Structure formats: structure tokens, C-alpha cells
């Protein structure tokens, strides 16, 4: 598409998008155009409003577009075109991406003892309620664990809530400990969001006992 | 995919899918698997049920799956696997497609007079509330009108309701009537649903006057 | 979206779209904008052309857009905006839908004899190479058969060619003949395209013998 | 879905997926099922093979599935089910995600001089050829720059190649430098891939002059 301001909008929270160049109050020659999961191609919204879209997005007195509670289907492109008093046209172009932050990740079914030289199920990490899905990763003594290397293997599962569409992730870690290692290793799991500059979330550690 | 029974389910109505070969009442060794717009890949549902899916679909005493009110996101594949008292396993495979019937189509902005040898806007046909979209067509004295032939031209528009996802269609007919024709032609518009074996819906006719 | 001329384009065939209002030859102030399965949102194409898109769509001397061989990914919206010599702006808006016609449908594995009062597999109808999928239906003595009524049942299967994306459909008919019926019924199968005003295709008939 | 091994497969490279529990060589009771961008729901592949799928994926002598050159449409789920000599059944479940690494990112149109207290276009960063899209980010003297804070603003653009589907990203940085700052700041841009554990790519720095 074209150059846009990129906007990240949390599901369930309001969103206000500015119509650049609009007069501060009516009268206003402005039009919003949106192409989102709610539209077939472009929908035009005007300051007069009306109809079903008044339940979703309305133009404010200052020309900004207001959504009271963003949902997954609002992801897309939002554009404004305004004329000011002198007649200069100004365009605004926004790319809206939506997200939700899951609960703190948790480790369930952790092993209290591990045996060297055979595979052991260390635990299952679980994260509930994210959008977009994001990813789970395992760490040993603070350091990321790379699957399929050093006797490490991981299996993963994704499901979605049938009404909200939010993701639940599960990640099961198996390790084949090498003889001679630290008998009290510290494992942990982290959730990394799909969108950039969002913080990772991490579990409490587990410290199983390894028997040589 | 595999061979399945096709099921056509009206939006907002209940749906009961039978689990072939299940015992008539509990105890029952059976399992449903669904891959629909509500799932990431397959979801398994069992007679014990539980969790968020209990708000969407539950297994009945006789083993059938029940949805109290189908939505667009329930389109997809539904399978049951059951063992009877003797141990014969029986599979059921359903492909569920959902639909909604729009209101009666209407013609708006119809012309009361037409002029031979020039293009005239005959009218705009509108249909509100269909799923899947379906199509609009124009008829002259009962016979379908073919666009881009005999001075006929049509333009079309599709919108979706921002909350229900249902389609509204609009179709604008222009005709350049030829000199020497019927001075009182009868036009009408019909809505043809997307799904097979469903009846078309037709507008009342309009009978403009053609001036030579 | 907005009002558009609806265009149906056969896969593998060229497509020429007119830029209304363009001068007949260069110089030309015109721009094409496309949003199709090949684009992220809108792509702009100009008479100078250039780059990868020259392998897909180019602007002709008269301003029309030319695709030498349409594919599934070309389905979408194509718009032109032109200024003429006087400076009048003219917009063209096209909604392009693509299709392919399958081979003649065929019945395989047909029954030569049927037995009254029990279920019989009449045959399997097969259609290869359609886009969009379209549907298969069974007819008895010219009259459509309605599944789940009068001892009729149908199962269906859809697959896609892994490289071309075209659909193959299969439809298996079972009938439980009622005692006292015509001992030499005539069955046939028809393919109905997904797009409007396209002709149905039908199989040769089969005439099994019914034993009372 | 179910628990699976995640597989990350580079576009254009071969992929071999193991069928756990298969005999080392024929005879072999095993079957692969795939649901990818090439299939309508599940496709079954067998050691005998045949048809169009032989051009895409084949079962090897040892039972593994081989794709000679992965594409975007091979993203999806791949499962094998095998019985050994004794009759133990073993399942393998793989979730295949595909990727491509773009060329080194580059800054174009960089500013050689900046003026304090007004907005300046620092440069445009460009990355060509990624899958999935990934993201571009700006850094000042090694630290990430956060948009809409401290006189920083960014606009972004995404295009796809019309034949390969690979992404090109562009990111334009504007800064209003504050009076009193470093007169020789160092800016750079980095590409962060969509998939986890893949390395970022970074541009050479630019060091404009700031005029107080
Ligand atoms: C000039 C104008 C009117 C009007 O005054 O008729 N409405 C508008 C909506 C968007 C953009 Br740009 C310009 C206008
Ligand atoms: C108070 C109000 C006015 C007005 O003062 O005219 N217009 C609006 C448009 C959208 C939303 Br939400 C609130 C208002
Ligand atoms: C082409 C375009 C851009 C851009 O290139 O940034 N922004 C816009 C905002 C509103 C409308 Br209406 C059109 C555009
Ligand atoms: C997109 C979406 C919503 C929503 O838009 O609210 N709800 C869902 C429930 C299950 C799956 Br799968 C996807 C969704
Ligand atoms: C044997 C069996 C159990 C059980 O072990 O009780 N549960 C089941 C669910 C579906 C199908 Br088919 C078979 C079974
Ligand atoms: C009444 C009832 C029983 C029961 O009697 O055990 N089980 C159920 C499962 C689904 C729905 Br809906 C209703 C019932
Ligand atoms: C699929 C769908 C639903 C639903 O599933 O309720 N609602 C919608 C509103 C607008 C657009 Br576009 C699509 C949908
Ligand atoms: C005026 C004009 C130029 C130009 O002469 O600079 N190029 C164009 C492309 C599309 C449309 Br409408 C108008 C123009
Ligand atoms: C011959 C030719 C000219 C020219 O004569 O300048 N321009 C073109 C643009 C597209 C395609 Br396809 C063919 C031509
Ligand atoms: C808004 C619009 C329509 C319509 O409403 O029919 N057609 C177009 C053709 C080209 C460009 Br650029 C914009 C439009
Ligand atoms: C859309 C499509 C193409 C194409 O665009 O050529 N090829 C395919 C092969 C299998 C499946 Br499923 C879909 C496609
Ligand atoms: C028993 C068996 C046959 C056969 O009957 O020879 N083919 C198979 C393919 C996959 C899996 Br698990 C088991 C079998
Ligand atoms: C050489 C060969 C055999 C065989 O030796 O039987 N089977 C195969 C299946 C797939 C691909 Br690729 C190569 C082979
Ligand atoms: C998925 C894809 C392919 C491919 O699978 O080769 N090619 C493309 C060209 C443009 C756009 Br948009 C998407 C694709
Ligand atoms: Cl819409
Ligand atoms: Cl799910
Ligand atoms: Cl693009
Ligand atoms: Cl398929």
C-alpha cells in the first residue's frame, strides 16, 4: 500500500485517530475511508454519520474518528481527507494493528527429578489470552534453549477461544541431560508477543534435581 | 477433503448433527472433532464437555452435537467417531455451510420515462441481509437481460453490515432503448442466493414509458 | 466498496480493461490502481511501467490495462483515473472475478442393477478443473433429486489441484427405491458453475434395472 | 490443534519430514496427511504416490516425506501414521512455517545535515525479499528509537512482489532534534524477521551534522 502511520491498538480499548488538517470544529469538509475486517473494500464515514456504523465508529466534533472498544475485526487501513478554511487538502493514512496481552505464563506438570542420559519431560508452559498468537520459549539458567540441539526437544500447541478469538499456547519441553552437568539447573519459560517493542513475560523458575 | 454429508444451516437457527453408530444414551465411547471459523485446526469435543465451548456446542444425551444458534464462524467440518456395545467404530463426516435469506429485493429511483436512442438510468435494485452474498439480475418482460449487449449496462456494489457480516447488494441498470420498440416495457430484478436449491426472490415490476 | 462494472475473466486468457476518458494515444495523464491477490492493499501502475509488474500487467498505448494471461491471484478491484485534454477527470471501476470451465462431468462406478427397498449406490459423478468450485447435482428422468427425501442420500468431496488450484468435485448418490416404481429409471448428473449466467454441464444418462 | 513439532522451512529449499516408527525400508504400512495452502482440508499421500502431487511431495524409501523446493503454499500441518513389524502404531505431527531472508537492509535518501528544533527527514530504510513481512526499526547511537516520543516520527509502507509474494518494507524516519544535543548523531536501521530465533539484519550507519 502507501506510506502510513502505524497504530497498535489494544483489544477492548478506545481508539482515537486524528484527521490532520481538519478545522477544529464544524463546519468541516472531511471524509474517513476504512478497509478493515468489518468492510467489503472501502467504507466511507462522514461527520453526519448514521446507520449501523454509528455503533462502531463515529466522527467527533474535531474530525477525529472514535472507536469506543476496538476488536480483532478493526485491523486494517483508516484514511482521512480534509479541506481546511483556505482549501488546502490534507491526507491522513493509518495502518491499525490490534493486540491483546495474555495472562502471566505458567509452567504446569513440572518434573521434580530428572535422570541423566534419558529423555525427561521437564514441564509444560502455558500462556492464555494473546493476540496475535505470539510464541513461547524455554530458558536454562537465563540462556535460551535451542530445540533439536544438546538433547533438547519441544512440542507446541495453539488453540483459540471460540468466542473471543484470543490464543492459548502450550509448549512442552523434554531434555536428555548429559552426564556431568549441574545437578540443580534452573528452567523457565517466556512469552514473546507478536508485535514489536512489547515486553516479554516470563514464568517463575523451576529447579529440578538431576540424578547421575 | 474426504466424502461428507453436506449440511446447509441458517444463521441464528439451531443445528443438530447426528453421531452415527452411537449408543442411544450414555455410556458412550464417542468424540466430535470440528474445524470451523472458531478453531485453530481441529478442536475435540466430548460428552463431558466443559469450558468455553459449552457456550457454543454441546454433546446431547443421544450423542448428537447441538449448536443453539449457528453463526458465520460455524462454517466448516464436523466429524464424529463412535464405538457401539459390540465395538464397531462408525465415522460421521459433515461439511456445514451457513446462509441467511435477505429481505425481499426492491427497486429504488426507478425511471418513469425513458428516451429512445440515448442511455437512461432505469433503476437501482437493492437486496439487504444475505449470506453468502448472492447476486442481483435484471429481467425485461420475464427474460434475463445480458449486460454489455443490446444497449444494456449494469453497475454493481456490495457492502457488509459491520456487526452481522451480512451482505447488501445494489445493482444499477442503464438501457439505451432502440427506436421502434415496445413503448411500455416491464423491468424487474431478482436475487439469486449463493447456495444451491434455494429459491430466487423477485421485485415487483416497473413499467416505464418509452418516448420515440 | 463502490459501484463497479463487474468483469468475469477466464483463467489463462488475456484481459483488457478500458481507461474511460483517457486520450486515445500518449500524452496521457492516467493512473491505474489495483487491489488483487497479488497486492498488499493498492498498487499503482502508470503508462511508463517498469519493474516486476511489467511481467503481469502493462498500460497499453490507448491507456487500457492488459494482462496477457489471467490467474486466480488477479481477482480483485481495478481502477483507472484519467484527465483528458480539457482537464475533465474520469474514473473507471472494475470488479474482476476469475473462472475456469471444468471438463464434461462423468459418472463412474455406476450400478447396473438396483434392488427395491434397500439402499443402492447408484454412481459417483466427477467434475475436474473448475474455478470457483461450483456444485454437482443429480437428476431422475430430467427432474432434480432432493437429498434426504424419498430415500435419496448424497455424499460429496472437494479437492484442489496442488499446482493450479482448480477444483475437482465428486458426488456419490444412494437411493432406496420404493416398491412399485419405474423399473428403468434414468439418472444423470449436472455441474453448475459458481458464476452467474454460465451454462450447466451434464453427463450422459444411466439407466439401471430395478428389481422388485 | 494438537501438539506438534514446529518446523521452519526456507522458501526454495528442500524439506524432509521423518515418519517416526516406520520400517527402515519397504514394506511399510504408513500414510501421510497434509493440510496446507495447496489443499482443500486433508490430502492423503501414500508410498505408492501418483498424480499431480508427485510434482510436489513424495514418500521416500525410508517413509519420510520429501518436498524438493518449499513454497509459501506449503505452510500448514503434516502428519504421518505408521505401523511397525510388531504392529505398534506411531503418529508424527509437524507444523510447518515457511520463511525467506531479505537482502541486507539499506538506507536511501539520507540527510547529510539536520536543523535543530524543526522536523527533518533523516532517511528511508528499505528491506527487500522477506517472508513473513518482518519489521523495520530505527536506532540512535545503538539505542532503539521509539516513535511519537522525543520528536521522533516514523511512517511505513509494505509491498509484495507480484510473482513471488515476498515482502518489501520501507520506513521513513523524521526527527525534530532538540537544541543542545550531540552534533554528530549516528542513526541506523534494522530488519527483525517474523520468525523466532532468527538474527536481525542492520544497515551501515549514517552520521548527519546537526546545526544549532
Ligand atoms: C470541498 C469538500 C466538500 C464540500 O465543501 O462540498 N466536502 C469535502 C470532503 C473531503 C474533502 Br478533501 C473535500 C470536501
Ligand atoms: C457531543 C457530540 C457531537 C456534537 O456536539 O455535535 N458530535 C459528536 C460525534 C460523535 C460523538 Br462519540 C459525540 C458527539
Ligand atoms: C494515497 C494516500 C496516502 C499516502 O500515500 O500516504 N495517504 C492517504 C490518506 C487518505 C486518502 Br483518501 C489517500 C492517501
Ligand atoms: C477473529 C475472531 C473473533 C472476533 O473478531 O471477535 N472471535 C473469534 C473466535 C474464534 C476464532 Br478462530 C477467530 C475469532
Ligand atoms: C474405546 C474408546 C474409548 C475408551 O477407551 O473408553 N473412548 C473412545 C472415543 C471415540 C472412539 Br471411535 C472410541 C473410544
Ligand atoms: C439434559 C442434558 C443432559 C443430561 O440429562 O445428562 N446432558 C445434556 C448435554 C447437552 C444439553 Br444442551 C442438555 C443435556
Ligand atoms: C464473518 C463476520 C461476522 C460474524 O461472524 O458475526 N460479522 C462480520 C461483520 C463485517 C464483516 Br466484513 C464480516 C463479519
Ligand atoms: C493532471 C495529471 C497529471 C499531470 O499532468 O501531472 N498526471 C495525472 C494522473 C491521473 C489524473 Br486524474 C491526473 C493527472
Ligand atoms: C508497442 C507498445 C508501446 C508503444 O508503442 O510505445 N507501448 C506499449 C505498452 C504495453 C504493451 Br503490452 C505494448 C506497447
Ligand atoms: C470512488 C471511485 C469509484 C466509484 O464510486 O464508482 N470509481 C472509481 C475509479 C477510480 C478511482 Br482512483 C476511484 C473510484
Ligand atoms: C490460488 C491457487 C493457485 C494459483 O493462484 O495459481 N494455485 C493453487 C494450488 C492449490 C490451492 Br488450495 C490454491 C491455489
Ligand atoms: C494396517 C495398515 C495397512 C494395511 O492394511 O496393510 N495400511 C496402513 C497405513 C497407516 C497405518 Br497407522 C496402518 C495400516
Ligand atoms: C529411488 C526412489 C525409490 C525406490 O528406489 O523405490 N522410491 C522413491 C520415492 C521418492 C523419491 Br524423490 C525417490 C525414490
Ligand atoms: C502467496 C503468494 C505467492 C506464492 O505462493 O508463490 N505468490 C504471491 C504474489 C503476490 C502475493 Br500478495 C501473494 C503470493
Ligand atoms: Cl462494507
Ligand atoms: Cl482451537
Ligand atoms: Cl503490493
Ligand atoms: Cl485437496
DSSP string, A59-126: E-TTS-EEESS--GGG-EEEEEEEE-TT--EEEEEEEEEEEBPPPPPEEES--SEEETTS-EEEEEEE
State the distance between the two ends of chain A, measured CA to CA, in whole angstroms.
Answer: 59
Looking at residue B5, the DSSP 8-state letter turns out to be E
Minimal CA–CA distance to A192: which of A132, A124, A149, A109?
A132
Q: For residue A138, what are the contacts with CB-CB under 8 A and spacing of at least 6?
A: A122, A125, A144, A145, A152, A154, A171, A173, A187, A188, A189
Ligand 11 site, residue D39, Cβ cutoff 6 A: yes
* DSSP type of residue A164: T
Q: Which residues contact B153 (CB under 8 A, 6 or more apart)?
A: B119, B147, B173, B174, B175, C5
Q: How far is the CA of D61 from the centre of ligand 13 (A)?
A: 6
Burial tier of A84 (Cβ tally within 10 Å: 0-12, 13-18, 19+): middle
Name the CA dihedral angle for C144, C102, C104, C110, rounded to a multiple of 10 degrees: -60
- Residue D47 grid cell: 508410498
What lies within 8 Å, CB to CB, of C202 at 6+ separation is C105, C139, C188, C189, C190, C191
**Beta carbons within 10 angstroms of residue C121's beta carbon:** 13
Residue with cell 513389524: D85
Q: How far apart are CA C40 and CA C57, in angstroms?
A: 16
- Pick among A17, A155, A170 to test the D interface (most D CBs inside 10 A): A155
Contact B197 C146 (CB under 8 A): yes
Method: X-ray
Three cell numbers, residue D45: 499421500
Task: For chain B, list the strands marked E by DSSP.
Answer: 5-10, 15-17, 29-36, 43-45, 58-59, 65-67, 76-83, 89-99, 106-108, 113-115, 120-130, 135-140, 143-144, 152-160, 167-175, 187-192, 201-202, 209-211
Choosing from D73, D160, D164 the residue with most ligand 11 atoms within 8 A of its CB, the one to mutate for a pocket test is: D73
Number of CB pairs, chain B paired with chain D, less than 8 A apart: 14
Q: Grid coordinates in use for C28? A: 496521457
d(CA C164, CA D38): 9
Phi, psi of C53 (to 5 degrees): -65, -25
Which residue lies with its CA nearest to atom 8 of ligand 14? D165
- B60-74: burial string, b at 16+ Cβ within 10 Å, e else: eeebbbebeebbbbb
Query: Who lines ligand 12 at CB under 6 A?
Result: D 29-31, 81-83, 89
CA distance A127 to A134: 9
CA distances from A107 to A151, A166, A171 (A): 20, 20, 9
Secondary structure letter of residue B200 according to DSSP: P
Residue A106 sits at φ, ψ, to 5 deg, of -135, 150
Q: Name residues whose C-beta falls within 8 Å of residue A168's C-beta, 6 or more positions apart in sequence.
A: A126, A127, A128, A129, A130, A158, A159, A160, A161
Residues 178-207 of D with CB under 8 A from C: none
Chain C residues whose CB is inside 8 A of the B3 CB are 155-157, 170, 172
CA–CA separation, D147 vs A5, rounded Å? 10
For cell 483528458, the residue is: C84
CB D34 within 8 A of CB D43: yes
Q: How many other C-beta atoms can be found within 10 angstroms of the C-beta atom of residue A184?
A: 10
Cell 524455554, residue? Answer: A138
Grid coordinates given for D133 = 513481512
Residue C55 three-state SS: helix
Residues A161 and B52: their CA atoms lie apart, in Å, by 7
Q: Rounded CA gap, D170 and D163, in Å?
A: 19
Using CA atoms, how far residue D194 sits from B133, D1, D134, D136, in Å, is 35, 21, 4, 11
How far A51 CA sits from the closest chain D CA (Å)? 33
Query: What cell numbers appear for D183 in the block?
Result: 552534533
Report the alpha-carbon distance of residue D51 to residue D41 in Å, rounded.
Answer: 18
Rounded Cα gap, residues D142 and B88, in angstroms: 67
CA distance D212 to D209: 10
Place of cell 520459549: A137
**Cβ contacts of residue D18 below 8 Å, gap of 6+?**
D63, D64, D80, D92
Contacts of B56 (CB under 8 A, 6+ apart): A162, A163, B38, B67, B74
- Within 10 angstroms of residue C170's Cβ, the number of other Cβ atoms is 17
Give the chain C residue whose CA is nearest to the CA of B8: C147
> How many other C-beta atoms lie within 10 A of the C-beta of residue C183?
13
Q: Is B133 helix (H, G, I), strand (E, B) or coil?
A: coil
Helix (H) or strand (E) run with residue A144 in it: strand A143-144
- Distance, in Å, from the CA atom of B105 to the CA atom of D26, rounded to the nearest integer, reads 63
C-beta of residue B128 within 8 angstroms of C-beta of residue B37 = no
CB D102 within 8 A of CB D128: yes
Q: Which helix (H) or strand (E) holds A168?
A: strand A167-175
The C-alpha atoms of residue B142 and residue A168 are separated, in whole angstroms, by 56
* Cβ(D97)–Cβ(D10) below 8 Å: no
| Cβ(A119)–Cβ(A174) below 8 Å | yes
Cis peptide before D172 (omega within 30 of 0): no
Measured CA to CA in angstroms, residue D186 lies from D26, D200, D203, D207 at distances of: 62, 18, 12, 5
Q: Which three cell numbers stand for residue B135?
A: 447476486
- Biggest CA–CA distance in chain C, Å, is 82
Q: Find where cell 448424497 sits.
A: C154
Examine residue C19 and say whether the peptide bond preceding it is cis (omega within 30 degrees of 0). Answer: no
Locate the DSSP E strands across chain D: 5-10, 15-17, 29-36, 43-45, 58-59, 65-67, 76-83, 89-99, 106-108, 113-115, 120-130, 135-140, 143-144, 152-160, 167-175, 187-192, 201-202, 209-211
Residues of C in contact with B170 (CB under 8 A): 3
| C92 shares contact with chain B (CB less than 8 Å) | no
Among D67, D81, D74, which residue's Cα sits nearest to residue D95? D74
CB count within 10 Å of CB B11 equals 18
Atom of ligand 10 nearest to the CA of C2: 5
Residue A152: enclosing H or E segment and its boundaries? strand A152-160
Question: What's the grid cell of residue D201?
Answer: 539484519
CB contact under 8 Å between B39 and A162, yes or no, is: yes
Largest CA distance in chain D: 82
Q: Write the CB contacts of D192 (distance below 8 Å, at least 6 apart in sequence).
A: A196, D134, D135, D136, D137, D200
Contact criterion met (CB < 8 Å) for D1 and B77: no
Dihedral of CA D38/A166/A78/A43: which sign? Answer: positive
In testing the pocket of ligand 7, which one of A35, A37, A51 has its CB within 8 Å of the most ligand atoms?
A: A37
Cβ of A156 within 8 Å of Cβ of D95? The answer is yes
Estimate to the nearest angstrom the gap between the alpha carbon of A192 and the chain centroid: 9
Give phi and psi for A211, each to the nearest 5. -95, 125
| Residue A54 backbone dihedrals phi, psi, to 5 degrees | -60, -20
How distant, in Å, are the alpha carbons of B126, B139, B168, B187 from that of B203? 10, 10, 15, 9
Q: d(Cα A147, Cα D4) in Å, to the nearest integer? A: 13
Q: Distances in Å between the alpha carbon of D24 and those of A111, C142, D48, D61, D91? A: 34, 55, 16, 8, 16
Helices (H) and strands (E) in chain C, counts: 0, 18
Across the beta sheet with B76-83, the strand order is B5-10, B89-99, B76-83, B29-36, B43-45
In short, whether D38's Cβ falls inside 6 Å of ligand 11 is yes
Q: How many CA atoms lie within 13 A of C146 on its CB side?
A: 4
Cell matching residue B90: 462408525
B211: how many CB neighbours lie within 10 A of its CB? 10
Are B30 and B49 in contact, with CB atoms under 8 Å apart? no
Resolution (angstroms) equals: 1.8
What burial letters (b/e) apply to C186-202, b meaning 16+ CB within 10 Å?
Answer: ebbbbbbbeeeeeeebb
Amino acid at each position: 500500500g502507501a506510506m502510513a502511520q502505524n497504530i497498535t491498538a489494544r483489544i477492548g480499548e478506545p481508539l482515537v485517530l486524528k484527521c490532520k488538517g481538519a478545522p477544529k470544529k464544524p463546519p468541516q469538509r472531511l471524509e474517513w475511508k476504512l478497509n478493515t475486517g468489518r468492510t467489503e473494500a472501502w467504507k466511507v464515514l462522514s461527520p453526519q454519520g448514521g446507520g449501523p456504523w454509528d455503533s462502531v465508529a463515529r466522527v467527533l466534533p474535531n474530525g477525529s474518528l472514535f472507536l469506543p472498544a476496538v476488536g480483532i475485526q478493526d485491523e486494517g487501513i483508516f484514511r482521512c481527507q480534509a479541506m481546511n478554511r483556505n482549501g488546502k487538502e490534507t491526507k491522513s493514512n493509518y495502518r491499525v494493528r490490534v493486540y491483546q496481552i495474555p495472562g502471566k505464563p505458567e509452567i504446569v506438570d513440572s518434573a521434580s527429578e530428572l535422570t541423566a542420559g534419558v529423555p525427561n519431560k521437564v514441564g509444560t508452559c502455558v500462556s492464555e489470552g494473546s493476540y496475535p498468537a505470539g510464541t513461547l520459549s524455554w530458558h536454562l539458567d537465563g540462556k535460551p534453549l535451542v530445540p533439536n540441539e544438546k538433547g533438547v526437544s519441544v512440542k507446541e500447541q495453539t488453540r483459540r477461544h471460540p468466542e473471543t478469538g484470543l490464543f492459548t499456547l502450550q509448549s512442552e519441553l523434554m531434555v536428555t541431560p548429559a552426564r556431568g552437568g549441574d545437578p540443580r539447573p534452573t528452567f523457565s519459560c517466556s512469552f514473546s508477543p507478536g508485535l514489536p517493542r512489547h515486553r516479554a513475560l516470563r514464568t517463575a523458575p523451576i529447579q529440578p534435581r538431576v540424578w547421575e
